[PDB]
Amino acid sequence: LKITRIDIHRTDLPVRGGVYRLSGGREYHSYDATIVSIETDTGLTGWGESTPFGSTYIAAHAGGTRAALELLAPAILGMDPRQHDRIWDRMRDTLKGHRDARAALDIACWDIAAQAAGLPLCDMTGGRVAGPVPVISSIGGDTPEAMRAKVARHRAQGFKGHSIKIGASEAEGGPALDAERITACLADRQPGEWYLADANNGLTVEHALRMLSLLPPGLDIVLEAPCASWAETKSLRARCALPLLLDELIQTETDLIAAIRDDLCDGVGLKVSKQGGITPMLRQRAIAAAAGMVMSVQDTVGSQISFAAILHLAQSTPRHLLRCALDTRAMTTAELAEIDAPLRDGGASAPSDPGLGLRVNRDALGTPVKTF
Amino acid sequence: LKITRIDIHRTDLPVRGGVYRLSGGREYHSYDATIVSIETDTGLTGWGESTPFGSTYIAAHAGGTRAALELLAPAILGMDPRQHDRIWDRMRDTLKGHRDARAALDIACWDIAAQAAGLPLCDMTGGRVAGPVPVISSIGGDTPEAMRAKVARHRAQGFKGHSIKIGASEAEGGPALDAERITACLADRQPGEWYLADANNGLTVEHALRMLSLLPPGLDIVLEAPCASWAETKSLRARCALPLLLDELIQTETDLIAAIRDDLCDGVGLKVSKQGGITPMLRQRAIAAAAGMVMSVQDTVGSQISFAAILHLAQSTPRHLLRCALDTRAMTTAELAEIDAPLRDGGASAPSDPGLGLRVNRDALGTPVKTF
Amino acid sequence: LKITRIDIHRTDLPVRGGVYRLSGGREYHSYDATIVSIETDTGLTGWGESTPFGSTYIAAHAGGTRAALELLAPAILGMDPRQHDRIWDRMRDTLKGHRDARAALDIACWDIAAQAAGLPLCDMTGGRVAGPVPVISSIGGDTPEAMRAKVARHRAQGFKGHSIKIGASEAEGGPALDAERITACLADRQPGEWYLADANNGLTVEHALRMLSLLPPGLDIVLEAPCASWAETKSLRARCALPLLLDELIQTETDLIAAIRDDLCDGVGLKVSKQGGITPMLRQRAIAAAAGMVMSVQDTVGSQISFAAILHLAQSTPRHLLRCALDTRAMTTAELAEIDAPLRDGGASAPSDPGLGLRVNRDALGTPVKTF
Amino acid sequence: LKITRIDIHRTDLPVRGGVYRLSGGREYHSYDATIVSIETDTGLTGWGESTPFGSTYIAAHAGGTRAALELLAPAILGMDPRQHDRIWDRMRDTLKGHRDARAALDIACWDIAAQAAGLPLCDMTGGRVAGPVPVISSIGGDTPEAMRAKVARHRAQGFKGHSIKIGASEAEGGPALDAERITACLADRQPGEWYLADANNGLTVEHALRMLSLLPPGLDIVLEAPCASWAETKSLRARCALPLLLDELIQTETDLIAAIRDDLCDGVGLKVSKQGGITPMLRQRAIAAAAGMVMSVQDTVGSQISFAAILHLAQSTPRHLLRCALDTRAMTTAELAEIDAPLDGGASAPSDPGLGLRVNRDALGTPVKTF
C-alpha cells in the first residue's frame, strides 16, 4: 500500500450570517480553503481539509498552507499511508511547524487507512462512544442584544454549547461591554447547556480582571483564550476562579506539556488544522485526558470535509471530557461534500460508512491548483 | 501468645433502603463481605471485617481480598498477635499493597490484644474520650428533594453529620444539579450539624469550578474527594476557598505525607479497610493530628464488625479534630454480630467490654470458605 | 467481529542465571505467569501474558491477577477486539486498578487486531522505525565483582544497556557498597553502552545522597527508582544532578502527569504489565514523548509472549527517546512460544508476520484453569 | 487501675570523663537530674527520668522541670496510666510546652503499662526487631589530630557510628578548623561506619557554606543541627547537597510537619526528654518513618533510667531508618539503677516486663515533693 498521487484544490467559503468579528478589530467575510486528495496504488482516495481562519487567528494563512504543501506533498509520495507516526516524522523532517499543511495530508491518510480496514474513522480512533455528540455554536462579536439573538437561533436549531466571542476595546465599551455580552448571552439559558466566553487571545490581564469584577456572581461559564501570551495567561490564572480553556496557545504536543507543568488551564480547544491532523489530535487527546482536561473538538472553520474529521474524532472521545463538537455547517455557506450527519436526538452522530464517510462534490472544488 | 488458626468467611450485605448511587453511574444493591476470625493457643478469638465498596471505588474487590489472604494468612501464623508493628512488616514483605486484606487480619489481632489486656479497644488505642461520638450518614445520589428527605430521616435518627454524594454527568444536569443537591440537603439544617459533599473522585476540575461558582455564598460545607488524581486535586486546590477533604487518594502513610508536602487538604477520610486496619489508622491519625487535619473515621461499608473497629478508633480520637464516625448500621441491613452501642444522647458510645465488644452470630456467617 | 472465548493459563517460569536479588532483601527463584488466549467468531487467536515480579515489586501478584480476570474476562466477551479504547473503558468500569489483569487481555486484543489487519504489531503502533532495537540486560543483586562479570557476559552476547540492581543495607556496607557495585559494573565499559542504577524504590534519601557524594566525578549513569514514595523522590530530585528515571511510581497515565507537574524525572521505565498493556503503553509513550522523557521499554519479567509485546512497541518508538528494550529471554528459561527475533546487527528486530509474530506452544501452558 | 502517688526526686549526675564542650562556648561538669516514680492502687511502680543538658541546649533546665511537675503531677493523680493519649491531653490542658517535665511522668506511666501487660517496653511499642541496636560514639569538641585518635580509640572498641562536634568561632579557626576536624575524624575510616557532624545549632549560614566549600569532595557525612533558627536552616538547605539531620528544632509533632512541608531535612535526632516521653516519641517515629526520615534515638543525658527508655524505643524501630541509639551510661558516673543491657558497639533491650530496671530508690535521696 503506497501513496502515488496528491492533488491540491483551492476554494472560497462564504460566511453564514454576518461579518464574523473577533477581538482586536479582526473581521472575516469569507474563508480560503485548501482541499487535498490522496490516491493509493490500490485505487483508494482520501480527502483532507485545511482552512486557516484567514490570516490573523494564528500564524497561518491559506497561501502559506499551499506553499508548505509544495515541500510536504512530494516528501510523503511512496509512503504507506497507514504508518501515521512515520508519515508524521517524514513531514517534521521535511519542514518544522506548518501544522495547517500537515493536517490536510494527515486527514486524507487516515481517511485511506480507515477505508482499507472497512471501518468508519471513529472505529479506527478508539471506537464509537454511544449516542450522538452534542454540537457547539460560534457566536461572532456584536452588541449584547444581537449576540443573545444568535444564541437564540442556535438553541432553536438544537445546539447545546455556545462559544461567544468577547474582547471589546476601551473605545468600544471595554470590560463593561464584555460583561454585558456574557450576561445577555446567558440570560435565556436552559438546562444542559454549556457556555464558553472566547477572547481569542485578545484581553490584557487588566481587562480580564476588570471584566471578572463586573460579572454578576453565580454564573456557569468557562473562559477561553483570554490572553496573547503564556506569561499573561499565567498571571490571570493566579487571580481567576473560573475554569480556563486554552486554544491559540496550544498548538503542539509540547505546548500541552508546558500547560500541565505550569497548571495553566482546565481545558483545551483542539482544532484539527491547528493541531496538525488526526495523528496529533490523538496524541493531544491522550495527554489532555490523562491530565483531566476537558476538550472541545473543533476546527478553525471548514466545509463538510472538515466537519467529518471533527465528528469522527469527537465520536470516539470519552463523553466525561468532551465539550461538544463544532458544526462548521453553521459557519459557512459552502457545499463541498455530502455526509449523512443531521442534528437529531441531542446532537450529531458519525456515519457508519468506512473512512470519513463523505461524498465529495468534486466539481465544487475546481481543477487542482497542483498535482504531485 | 501465638496465632494458631485463621478462618475466612464470605457473606453478602444488602443495602439498607433503595439503590445506592455514586458519581460515574456507579450503583449498589449489596456488598460482598469477607469476615475473618483469628484464634490463639490460649483460646482467645478475634474478629475483623474487610468489605470493598464493590470493585469500582478503589483498586480493591472482594475476590481480590480473598486471594490476598491466601498469601497473608499463612504468613502470620505463629506470631504473637500483640506485636502490631512486626505483624505489619511481615504482611508487607509477603505482599505489597492489598491493604483491604491486611485490614481483616490486623483488626482481629487488635481484638485479641485488647482481650488479653482486659480492655476495650478504645482504651488500648489511647483511651476513651468522654461522651458519645457523633455519627455521620451516607446520602446516596438521587434528585435534590429525594436527597433532602434522606437527610431529614437521618436527622430524626439523631445523625449529626451527612455525607452527600455529588457528581452528575453533563447529560444528567452537570454542576447545576450538583449545586442544587447541595443547597437542598442543607435546606433544613439545625445547629451542630456538619456536611460533606463527596464526589468520590468523579469531578473534572472544570466541573468543580463551575459548581463552586453556582453555589450561593455563605454555605458551611466541606468538599470531599473532588478529583480522580493528584495533579487534578492540586489544580483545584489552588482555586478553591472551601475546606477540602481527601479520601480515595489517601491510602498509605506516605500518601498523607505527600498531602502535607503539597498542602493539598484540610481533612482526611480515614477508612479502616482502605488504610488497612487498626495499625495504619493509628499511624495516620498521628500524622493527621500533627498537621491539624480533621478526620472522619469511617469504613468503605460493613456490618457490626466493621462498625466496632470504627467506633473504638473514633472513641479514642480527640474531639477537636474528629468529624464523626460512620454508623455502618445505617448503610446495611445485615446482623452479623450484636453490639451495645445505641445512638442516644448526641451519638454512639463504644462498649466497655474487652476487645471489640462483639457477640458474633456465627450462624449468619456461613461455613468458612477457607482455613489456615 | 466479536470476542467469543477467553482461556486463562497458569504456568511457572524458572529464573535464568542464579537467584535474582532486589534492594530490601527480596529474592526471586521462579515467576508465576498468567497467559491468556482470546478467540473471535472468525477463528482468530490472540495471546497475552502477565507475570508480576513475585508479590513484592508493586501491589500485584499472580493470584490477584487471576482473581481480577474473573471480573474482567466476562466483562469484555462479545466486544469488537479492535476497539482498544472502548475495551479499556469497559475494563475500568468493571474494576479499578489491576493493570496486570488488563494487560494480558489488552495485548491479546491487539494481537487479534494486528492479525485481522495483516500487519506486524509494530506497523499497527505507528510504524517500524528502521534498524534493530538495542537490548538491555538485567543485572540482579550480588557482589561488585560478581555483578561486573554478569555485565561482561551480557556484553559478549551483544547487550548494549545494563540495568544494575543496587540498594544495600547498612549491615552489608550501605551507600559505599552501592557506590562500589556501580564503579565495578562500569569498569569494562565500551562505546555505545547505557547504564541505569536501579534501586527499586529501596533507598532512603539519606542513603542516596551519601552514595552520590561517594561516587567518583565524571560518571555517565542514570539513577532509577531511588526512593519508596513520591515525597521522598521529590526531596532527592531537589539535590540530585544525575538524570533520574522513575519506574514503580509510574503505573497510570495520571502518575506520569504528576511527574511532569512536579518535574520529578528525566525518564520513565515503562513495563508492559505495570502500565497495563499495549493501549496504556501507547498513551504513556505519547505523554513521555511530548515531555521529552527518555523511555526504557520493558516488562516486569516474562516468556516470549511478554517479549514479543516489548519488542513490537520498542520497534515503533522514536529512537531519539528509546533507552533499550528488555530481552526477557535472558531472564527466564521457559520456552512458551517461538519467535524469530535474534540478537544481531546491534539488537533485536521485530518479526514481519501479522500480529505479535508468535508460534505459541499450546501444551506448554497446560489445560486452562478457567474459560469464559 | 489508678495512679495514687507520685514522688519527685532530684539527684546530681557527675560527668564521666572530660568536661563536655558544645558550640558557642558551652561547658558542663555535672547534670541536674529529675527522677519520678509513680505508684498505682495495685502496687505497681513506674520510673521516668528527665534531665536537661544544662540550661542552654534547648529552652529547659532542671529547676524549670521541677517547677512544671508541681502543676503536672497533681493533674494526673487518679488517672489510668495505661491511657497514654488521655494523660497527654490532661497534661497539655494543664501546662503548655515543658515537654521535659511531661517526659518523666509519661515514661513512668508507660513503665506501669508494660508491667501490667507482662511485656518488655520494646514489645509494647510495636515489637522487638532482631539483633542488637548500634550505639553512637561521641567525639568531643577538641583539636583535629586529637579528634581522629579518639575515633581510632572508639573504633578499636567496636563502635561504628560517630557523632563529631563542630562549630569553631573565627578567633579559634572558623570553618577551616571545622573542615579539618571532619576530614581528620574520617581519615582512617573502615567499612560499615556512619558519621554525623553536630553543630548544635551554632553555625551561621555563611560559616556553614564556607565549611562545605572547604571540605574535600567524596566524603560520606551527615550534617546535624547546623543553624539556630528555622529560616537560617531553610537558607542553608537550598544550597546544601549533604544529608541534613535536625535536632533542637524538632521538639513537637507540629515541628516535624513543618519540616516535611518545607522539605527541610532527611533525618531527625529524637531525644526522649526533648520530644516529651514515650508517647510523643512514638507519634514522631510514625511521622518520620512515613516521611522516610532516618532517626537517631537518644536523650539529652541521663542515668540508666533514661537509657532504658532509649533502648526499648530503639529496639522497636525499623532498622533501615535507625541511626544508632545513645548510651547515656558513657556520659555520667551515676549508678541509679541496674539494667541487663551490656555492650560490640551494640546493646539489646532486656526481656523483663516494663523498662527492665532495678531502681535503687535510696540512691535518689528523699523526694523533694510527693503528691
Side-chain angles (χ1 to χ4, degrees), chain C residues 45-330:
Chain C
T45 301
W47 295 96
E49 172 185 355
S50 184
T51 141
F53 208 84
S55 78
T56 54
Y57 164 72
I58 50 178
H61 66 119
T65 311
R66 287 180 294 259
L69 289 162
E70 292 288 317
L71 288 199
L72 291 176
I76 75 160
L77 276 174
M79 294 192 76
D80 173 0
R82 292 170 302 185
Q83 289 176 235
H84 45 264
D85 288 354
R86 307 285 77 75
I87 290 165
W88 195 259
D89 288 344
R90 177 58 72 73
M91 290 191 296
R92 312 173 78 248
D93 70 30
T94 308
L95 172 65
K96 219 137 223 139
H98 306 75
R99 286 180 173 237
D100 50 304
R102 310 186 186 159
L105 299 171
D106 185 75
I107 304 158
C109 284
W110 278 90
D111 198 10
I112 298 172
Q115 292 182 59
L119 285 177
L121 181 65
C122 61
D123 297 340
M124 287 288 287
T125 61
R128 171 191 304 272
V129 179
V133 177
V135 288
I136 181 164
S137 88
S138 193
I139 306 319
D142 215 308
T143 72
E145 284 313 288
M147 280 178 162
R148 173 186 180 169
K150 306 155 96 152
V151 166
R153 294 203 312 268
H154 282 96
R155 175 182 291 114
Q157 317 187 247
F159 279 77
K160 274 182 168 86
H162 304 281
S163 177
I164 77 196
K165 305 301 182 284
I166 63 168
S169 71
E170 289 293 316
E172 318 162 346
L177 174 59
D178 286 325
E180 292 181 29
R181 299 171 149 148
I182 289 163
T183 49
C185 286
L186 291 165
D188 306 324
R189 189 183 189 153
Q190 303 295 315
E193 313 193 315
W194 187 76
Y195 293 79
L196 261 172
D198 183 6
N200 301 89
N201 273 207
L203 313 174
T204 53
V205 180
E206 181 253 27
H207 176 138
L209 299 165
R210 282 159 69 210
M211 177 181 88
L212 266 27
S213 187
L214 285 168
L215 289 175
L219 283 188
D220 170 14
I221 187 129
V222 176
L223 186 54
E224 175 174 7
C227 301
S229 68
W230 206 270
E232 288 167 273
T233 307
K234 294 211 274 172
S235 314
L236 184 54
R237 186 50 163 185
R239 260 144 231 115
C240 174
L242 262 50
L244 192 73
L245 184 140
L246 290 195
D247 188 28
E248 286 91 317
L249 290 183
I250 309 305
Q251 302 176 38
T252 68
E253 294 71 51
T254 61
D255 291 336
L256 196 46
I257 300 294
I260 289 159
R261 162 80 49 84
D262 284 341
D263 186 20
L264 187 56
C265 68
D266 311 298
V268 60
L270 297 177
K271 283 174 159 76
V272 187
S273 76
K274 172 164 58 76
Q275 316 329 126
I278 312 314
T279 303
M281 283 287 288
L282 293 177
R283 300 179 186 190
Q284 299 177 18
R285 179 162 86 181
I287 303 171
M293 288 173 179
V294 296
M295 281 169 268
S296 194
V297 179
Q298 306 191 358
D299 199 6
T300 39
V301 60
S303 75
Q304 289 77 20
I305 299 162
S306 169
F307 182 56
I310 285 161
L311 176 66
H312 272 293
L313 285 168
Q315 190 77 65
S316 60
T317 303
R319 208 46 68 71
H320 164 78
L321 305 164
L322 188 72
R323 286 302 183 276
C324 305
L326 179 73
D327 192 351
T328 44
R329 297 172 314 176

Side-chain angles (χ1 to χ4, degrees), chain B residues 8 88 364:
Chain B
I8 317 299
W88 182 263

Side-chain angles (χ1 to χ4, degrees), chain A:
Chain A
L1 184 54
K2 269 181 216 286
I3 295 149
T4 56
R5 191 168 101 141
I6 309 186
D7 279 9
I8 321 299
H9 312 268
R10 173 189 188 190
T11 187
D12 189 57
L13 316 176
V15 177
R16 177 180 307 269
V19 189
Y20 202 89
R21 305 187 190 82
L22 304 183
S23 61
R26 292 174 291 177
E27 287 187 324
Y28 307 78
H29 304 279
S30 67
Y31 310 107
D32 183 353
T34 304
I35 295 107
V36 172
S37 64
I38 304 187
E39 279 174 40
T40 54
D41 56 9
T42 53
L44 297 166
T45 295
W47 296 92
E49 193 185 340
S50 185
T51 141
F53 200 70
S55 59
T56 48
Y57 162 72
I58 57 169
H61 66 118
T65 307
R66 291 181 290 259
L69 291 161
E70 284 265 13
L71 290 185
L72 295 183
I76 68 148
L77 278 183
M79 283 191 79
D80 179 356
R82 287 164 310 177
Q83 289 190 209
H84 53 261
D85 283 5
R86 306 285 82 76
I87 302 263
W88 188 258
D89 282 352
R90 169 71 55 88
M91 293 186 308
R92 282 189 93 251
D93 294 338
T94 311
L95 173 63
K96 200 162 256 187
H98 296 78
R99 294 177 166 235
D100 49 311
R102 301 193 190 157
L105 294 172
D106 188 79
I107 295 164
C109 278
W110 276 86
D111 183 24
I112 291 174
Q115 292 178 53
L119 291 171
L121 174 62
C122 62
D123 288 330
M124 295 286 298
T125 60
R128 175 183 301 277
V129 174
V133 179
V135 295
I136 181 166
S137 70
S138 195
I139 317 278
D142 209 318
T143 75
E145 29 293 312
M147 293 184 101
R148 177 188 189 175
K150 286 139 90 169
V151 163
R153 315 160 201 3
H154 287 84
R155 173 182 291 117
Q157 281 192 249
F159 290 67
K160 279 306 228 152
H162 305 282
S163 177
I164 67 205
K165 297 321 166 191
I166 50 158
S169 77
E170 279 303 303
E172 295 153 9
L177 177 52
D178 292 324
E180 277 179 54
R181 282 173 170 158
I182 292 165
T183 58
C185 289
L186 297 192
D188 305 312
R189 179 179 199 152
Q190 284 301 301
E193 294 183 339
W194 184 79
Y195 293 79
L196 194 61
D198 189 355
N200 297 103
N201 271 211
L203 320 177
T204 55
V205 172
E206 185 249 35
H207 178 128
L209 288 176
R210 290 168 58 214
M211 178 180 76
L212 269 24
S213 173
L214 287 166
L215 285 173
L219 304 172
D220 179 4
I221 188 124
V222 173
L223 180 50
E224 170 173 37
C227 303
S229 66
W230 209 267
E232 283 166 275
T233 307
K234 302 196 204 190
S235 322
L236 172 61
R237 178 69 164 173
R239 241 141 251 122
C240 176
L242 264 42
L244 247 46
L245 190 139
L246 293 183
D247 182 40
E248 289 94 331
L249 289 184
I250 303 299
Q251 308 187 21
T252 68
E253 298 74 50
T254 60
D255 296 335
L256 201 45
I257 296 305
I260 284 47
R261 167 80 49 80
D262 283 330
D263 180 22
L264 217 65
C265 66
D266 314 293
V268 64
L270 300 173
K271 293 188 162 112
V272 180
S273 65
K274 163 155 69 67
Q275 312 334 116
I278 310 298
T279 304
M281 284 284 287
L282 302 160
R283 297 167 184 192
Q284 297 188 22
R285 172 163 85 184
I287 299 157
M293 272 175 175
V294 295
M295 280 162 273
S296 189
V297 181
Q298 309 193 23
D299 205 350
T300 36
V301 68
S303 62
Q304 293 82 17
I305 296 173
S306 166
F307 181 53
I310 293 163
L311 188 51
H312 278 293
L313 287 167
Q315 191 77 63
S316 65
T317 306
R319 213 47 69 73
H320 173 71
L321 301 174
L322 182 64
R323 291 294 186 274
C324 306
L326 182 61
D327 194 351
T328 54
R329 289 171 311 195
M331 286 190 85
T332 99
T333 251
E335 313 252 328
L336 300 192
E338 262 184 351
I339 185 200
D340 197 33
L343 256 70
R344 42 154 141 233
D345 309 304
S349 310
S352 39
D353 319 42
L356 293 165
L358 288 146
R359 284 164 300 294
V360 178
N361 306 322
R362 210 148 188 172
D363 293 317
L365 299 178
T367 162
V369 303
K370 189 58 194 255
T371 298
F372 289 90

Side-chain angles (χ1 to χ4, degrees), chain D residues 94-127:
Chain D
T94 303
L95 172 64
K96 212 113 169 202
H98 301 75
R99 285 176 181 239
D100 51 315
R102 295 193 194 163
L105 291 181
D106 176 83
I107 301 158
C109 285
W110 275 86
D111 186 14
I112 292 155
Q115 291 175 58
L119 285 156
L121 183 63
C122 64
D123 287 338
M124 288 282 295
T125 58

Side-chain angles (χ1 to χ4, degrees), chain D residues 193-211:
Chain D
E193 297 188 314
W194 188 81
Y195 297 88
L196 224 207
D198 189 1
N200 290 110
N201 271 203
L203 316 176
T204 55
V205 171
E206 186 252 40
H207 177 131
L209 293 171
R210 284 163 64 209
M211 179 178 81

